[PDB]
Design a protein around this ligand. Structure first.
Ligand SMILES: [Cu+2]
Ligand SMILES: [Cu+2]
Ligand code: NA
Ligand code: NA
Lengths: 620, 620
C-alpha cells in the first residue's frame, strides 16, 4: 500500500507493455534507465499514482527519448526527444561493453599494434571505458567508448596483471566504427600473474582461524512490513532501490515518546567519480562516473550468507529492468542485520555507589556493486543514540599500467614493470533534510580561539561561532579541519525544552576534494567534487549533482546550475550535498587484490532530544 | 622467563621488603608510583634483572625520593632526594582525595559560604582536583588540591546534577590546612535530578531488544603464553600494564613467512590532558593530566563478562602496589578477544569468472578507567592486513556548572540552570618505532596539485611529495587535512622486493589541537598538545611528553626540552609522539550520562610487505 514500496516484477512488465503498445519499444530500442519516481511534495497525498521514468536508446541512430509512464493508469504521461549534443548522452548499456572488443579485433590498426607486441588477439581483453569530453570535435553528438587493453594468458587468468600500455582506441558504438587508434610506443607487458587463488601465490592456507559464530536465538529486533518498511529501536524508514543510485533511504524518522519525528526525507549516494591523475595521453581522459555513466545498482552483487553478510540476515531482492523491459531480480541484493557495537554508556560513581554499563548496537543496510576491476560496498548504519552514518568500502583490483623505466611522479610500482596510476574515489551524498519537518536551515560551526586578556586572564577560554547560510550563492562551503568545522541542520520553528532549535550535526572526514586543475574537463563535469558541502533549495527535478545525462556532457550541469538560482534556504525545504572521497596512491599491499579501505560521514543529534535518547535501554 | 612479563604479587612484596630493609619505607612513607622498568637497549645482556622504579612520598613533609630497585638481586640501585619546588610534585595519592571534603567541613569560611546558600554541609560532596601552577606563591613546594562542591540530595543521588557555582577552596593536603576559600557570589543550585537509573526519568525499559549471541565453539584463535605473550594471525606481542600509563604494548611484530619482523618496540598513551575553556575564576585553573597527575592504571575497572566485554573473552588481572607496598590485583582489568570485522577483500571478475570474498577480523586489547565523573576506554586493535589502530572511548558524566542567566560563550546548557563548560580531551601516543629493526626515519607526505600546461595538457595530473625529517629541531609537525598529510616511518636499510624502503603510514584524524592561548599556564605545561607530531631520538629517560613529575610543575620538562638536543633522527632509533583529541561542546544528549564518543589514529603498512599479506586467508 505504501507509495515507497520497491518496484514489482509486475510493475516493470506493465511498463514494458505500455511502451510497446505506444510504439516506443521497437526492436531498435533499448532501455538505458528505468526507475520509479518519488511522490511529489504533498502532505496528505492519498491518490496512489505509481510513475516510472524511462530513458530509451535507439541503436539505429535515431534520437533517444525520455518517457514518463503511469503504471496505475496504464498511460504514457510524457515523451520528449533528446538532443544529446546539448544535454548529454544516455548511460552506457551493458551490451555495448562487448562491442568494443569485437570491433577492435577486426580493425587493421589495432591488429598491427598487437602484432608488433607479439600478442594474440584472442587473448587481448579490452576494458570499455567512458569517453568524457575533450578535444575531438568529431565526437560531439556520438556515443563514444574508449578501450584499453589487457592480456589474459588463459581463461581464468587475471588480465589486470598484464596491461598493454602505449595503446588506446576510440569507438563509435552506434555506427560501429573505430575512430582512432593511438599507439605511443611499445611498453613491455608485465609478465607476473596476479591470480590470488593460485596456491603458488597464496602459499598454504592458514589453519589458525577458529570460527566466530554470531546468532540471534530469538530472531532480529527489527521488523519488515510492506516489503521494505523497517522498524528498529525507535527508528522508522523505507529501503528503496534504484538502478542508478542503488540503495536509497526514505522517510528516516525517530519515535520520540509518542511522536514520530522526521529527520531525513531521502538519503542517497547521488554520484561517484573516479578521476585518474596520470598525464599520459593513454589515460589522461580516464574518469569513471560510476553512478551517472554506468548505473551502480544494475551491477549489484548477489550477497552470500556467511561470507558477504554474517549473522541473522534479512535479505531484500530488488527488481530492475533489463535493456528490453523484462524484469530482472537481483537475488539477495541487499543485506539487513543488526550488530553489537560495544559500549554505549558507562559510569562507575564513587559517591552514589552505582555502577552502570549499557551496550550499543547498530542497524546495517548494505549492498555491493562491481564495475569492471573495482568493487564497492555501500553501508548505511543507524545507531541507538540517534547517530546516522554512511560508509563506503573500496576493494577489488587496482587499475594498472606499465611502470616506466626511470620512474613516475603519477604512478605507483606494484610489481616488476607493473604500475598503478594515482586516482581518487569521490562520492556525493544527497540528503533531502526534514529535521522535525521541512522548515530547515544550515549553520557552519567553527571553533573560536580567544586571546589572553581582560575576561580571559588565564588564557584558557575558547568558544565557537555559527554562521547561518541564507542563500544558495553563499552555501558552497569548504572543510576546515584545523578549526573543527562542522555543519548543523536545524529547524528554527521546532525548539527543544531549553527553547533552542532542534538540530543534527554533520561530521565530515575532511579528506581532500578534487585535485585536478580547475580549468580541466573533469573539474567542469564533476564540479560538485571541488567543494565539501553544497546546500540547495529542494526542487523535484534537481536529483543528481552532475545532472540527468552525465555521459559525454560538456560540463556545468547539476549543482553549479542549481546554485546559480540563488534561492532562499533560511528555514525552507532544503537539500544538503556532501562531497567526500579517498585519494589513492596505490601501495604494494593493494596488489594483487586490494584489502578494504573506507571513507564516509556521520550525523549526530545536536539538541534534537531533550536528554539522552537511550536512557530506556535495558541492562541485559 | 620473559623480561616483559607482568609484575607479580611476589615482585611487589619483594620491592616492599627491599625498601623496608634499606630504611626507605618506614611508617611515614607512601608509595606514589611503582612500576617495572623496561630492559635497556641490548638484547639479552641482563639474562634476568627485573628493576622497579618507585616514587616515595613522606607524609611528615620531608623531601620525597625516587628509588630504583633490583628485585632479582635484592638491592637498591639508586635513591635520590627530590626538590619538588623545582622538578614537580609526586602524583596525587588516593588517600589525599579523601582529605579534602573532611577538612573543608570544619573550616568556618567554607561553612559560612554553604550557610549563605542554605546548604547542609552533610550533603555537600567536594570533587578534589589537581591544582596546576598559577599566581599563588604560597603553593610553591606544597601539595595542593582544589575543591569544587556538588550537592547530593540522598546517598544514591547523582551529585553532578547539583553544582554549587561561585565557590572554590584550596587545600594543603600535607599540613591539612585550608589555604584559601573564594566565594564570587551565590548561584542557584540546579534542582533537577540526573539519576539515569530512576524509572521516573528512564520511563519503562525497552522490551524490543533481542539477544545477539557471539560465541567461539572451538575457542579463540589467539594463544597466551608466559602470562602475557600473545600470538594471533601472524602477529606477536607482549601486553604490559603500568600503573601510570595503563596498558602498554611491547614487541609488536609480524611473522612474514619464516621471519619475525618487528614493527613497534613499545606503544602507549603516555599522557592525556583535559583542559577546560570556561574563563570563570571558579574553573579557569581546571586541567586534568589524567595519566601524569592521577595515574590512569590505578583506577582501572574490573570488566564484567557479557556487559563490558562480549564474546569469548580472555582476561588479564594486573597487579599494582597500594600506597604501603602491598600488592593489589585488578581482577579482570584487561579484556582480550577477537572480533569479526566485515569484508576483507572482494572481487567478482567478468573476464576470469572467479568470484572471491574474504572476511576480516581484529584482535582487541582494552581496559577502562574511571577518574571522578569521567570514564575512558582504551582500545588497541590489530587487523589481519597489518593495520594497527588505537581508539579512545569517552563516556561518563560531563562536568557541570551553573548556567548563567544571561547565557554564556564558554558553557553549554543541559537542563534548566545547569551548564557544562567547554573542554578538550587530548591524548599523546608514544610509539617507540622498530620498523624491521631500529634504523628508522620519518617522512612527511603531502599531496601535490599540478597546474595545467606542458606535460599536463588536460590538467588531470596530481602527485605527492615526501620530506625526510633529519633532525629533532625540524621534527615538530602540524596536520594539514587539506593536503592529505600523513607521515611515513620507514627503514632505509630494509628494502622490499621492488628495492623500496619498507614503511608504515600514520593516518591521523586531524582534530583540533590545544586551543588555549600560547601564553597560558596550560600551554606551557602541555606543550606536547600544541602540535600533532613530534619525533625524538630514543633515550632511556625520555618517557613522558610532560616529564616525570607533572603535578604542580611549571614548564621546563618534557618534549620541548628533549628536542632542543637536536639529535640526528635520519635512520636512527626514534620515537614518534602523536597528539590527538576531542573538542567537546556538550550537547543536551550528553545529559545525564554521556553516550560514547571516540577518537584515535591508525598505522597501515606502506610497502612493508611484498604483496598483500592476506592472500593466505581461507574462505570459511
Ligand atoms: Cu583506488
Ligand atoms: Cu568531554
Ligand atoms: Na528538505
Ligand atoms: Na625506536
Amino acid at each position: 500500500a505504501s507509495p515507497f514500496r520497491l518496484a514489482s516484477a509486475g510493475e516493470i512488465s506493465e511498463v514494458q507493455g505500455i511502451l510497446r503498445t505506444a510504439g516506443l519499444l521497437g526492436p531498435e530500442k533499448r532501455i538505458a534507465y528505468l526507475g520509479v519516481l518519488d511522490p511529489a511534495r504533498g502532505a496528505g497525498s492519498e491518490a496512489e499514482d505509481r510513475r516510472f521514468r524511462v530513458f530509451i536508446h535507439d541503436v539505429s541512430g535515431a534520437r533517444p527519448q525520455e518517457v514518463t509512464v503511469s503504471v496505475t493508469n496504464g498511460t504514457v504521461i510524457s515523451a520528449v526527444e533528446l538532443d544529446t549534443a546539448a544535454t548529454g548522452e544516455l548511460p552506457v548499456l551493458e551490451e555495448e561493453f562487448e562491442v568494443v572488443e569485437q570491433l577492435l579485433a577486426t580493425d587493421e590498426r589495432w591488429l598491427k599494434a598487437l602484432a608488433a607486441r607479439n600478442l594474440d588477439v584472442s587473448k587481448v581483453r579490452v576494458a570499455p571505458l567512458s569517453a568524457g569530453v575533450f578535444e575531438y570535435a568529431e565526437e560531439r553528438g556520438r556515443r563514444i567508448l574508449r578501450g584499453l587493453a589487457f592480456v589474459q594468458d588463459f581463461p581464468e587468468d587475471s588480465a589486470w596483471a598484464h596491461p598493454v600500455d602505449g595503446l588506446v582506441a576510440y569507438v563509435d558504438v552506434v555506427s560501429k566504427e573505430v575512430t582512432r587508434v593511438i599507439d605511443t610506443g611499445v611498453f613491455p607487458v608485465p609478465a607476473e600473474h596476479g591470480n590470488y587463488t593460485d596456491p603458488e601465490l597464496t602459499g598454504p592456507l592458514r589453519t589458525t582461524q577458529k570460527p566466530i559464530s554470531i546468532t540471534q536465538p530469538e530472531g532480529p529486533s527489527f521488523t519488515v512490513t510492506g516489503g521494505n518498511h523497517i522498524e528498529w529501536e525507535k527508528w522508522s524508514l523505507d529501503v528503496g532501490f534504484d538502478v542508478r543510485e542503488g540503495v536509497v533511504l526514505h522517510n528516516i524518522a525517530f519515535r520520540d515518546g509518542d511522536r514520530l519525528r522526521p529527520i531525513i526525507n531521502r538519503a542517497s549516494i547521488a554520484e561517484m567519480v573516479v578521476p585518474y591523475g596520470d598525464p599520459s595521453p593513454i589515460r589522461s581522459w580516464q574518469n569513471y562516473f560510476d553512478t551517472g555513466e554506468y548505473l551502480v545498482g544494475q551491477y549489484a552483487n548477489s550477497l552470500e550468507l556467511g561470507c558477504d553478510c554474517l549473522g541473522d540476515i534479512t535479505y531484500l531482492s530488488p527488481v530492475i529492468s533489463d535493456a528490453f523491459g523484462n524484469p530482472r531480480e537481483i537475488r539477495n541484493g541487499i543485506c539487513m542485520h543488526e550488530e553489537d557495537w560495544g559500549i554505549l554508556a558507562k559510569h562507575s560513581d564513587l559517591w552514589s555507589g552505582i555502577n552502570y554499563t549499557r551496550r550499543n548496537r547498530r542497524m546495517v543496510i548494505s549492498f555491493f556493486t562491481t564495475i569492471g576491476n573495482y568493487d564497492y560496498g555501500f553501508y548505511w548504519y543507524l545507531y541507538l543514540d540517534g547517530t546516522i552514518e554512511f560508509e563506503a568500502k573500496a576493494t577489488g583490483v587496482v587499475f594498472t599500467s606499465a611502470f616506466p623505466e626511470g620512474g613516475s611522479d603519477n604512478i605507483s610500482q606494484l610489481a616488476p614493470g607493473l604500475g598503478a596510476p594515482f586516482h581518487q574515489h569521490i562520492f556525493s551524498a544527497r540528503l533531502d533534510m526534514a529535521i522535525d519537518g521541512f522548515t530547515n536551515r544550515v549553520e557552519e560551526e567553527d571553533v573560536v580561539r580567544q586571546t589572553m586578556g581582560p575576561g580571559n586572564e588565564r588564557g584558557n577560554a575558547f568558544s565557537r561561532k555559527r554562521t547561518v547560510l541564507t542563500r544558495e550563492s553563499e552555501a558552497v562551503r569548504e572543510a576546515d579541519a584545523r578549526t573543527g568545522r562542522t555543519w548543523i541542520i536545524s529547524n528554527p520553528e521546532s525548539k527543544n525544552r531549553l527553547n533552542e532549535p532542534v538540530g543534527y550535526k554533520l561530521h565530515a572526514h575532511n579528506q581532500p576534494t578534487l585535485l585536478a586543475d580547475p580549468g580541466s574537463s573533469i573539474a567542469r563535469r564533476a564540479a560538485f567534487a571541488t567543494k565539501d558541502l553544497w546546500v540547495t533549495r529542494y526542487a523535484d527535478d534537481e536529483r543528481y549533482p552532475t545532472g540527468d545525462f552525465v555521459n559525454q556532457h560538456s560540463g556545468g550541469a547539476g549543482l553549479p546550475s542549481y546554485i546559480a538560482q540563488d534561492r532562499d534556504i533560511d528555514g525552507q525545504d532544503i537539500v544538503v550535498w556532501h562531497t567526500f572521497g579517498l585519494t589513492h596512491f596505490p601501495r604494494v599491499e593493494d596488489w594483487p587484490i586490494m584489502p578494504v579501505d573506507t571513507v564516509g560521514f556521520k550525523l549526530r543529534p545536536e539538541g534534537f532530544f531533550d536528554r539522552s535518547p537511550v536512557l530506556d535501554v535495558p541492562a541485559n
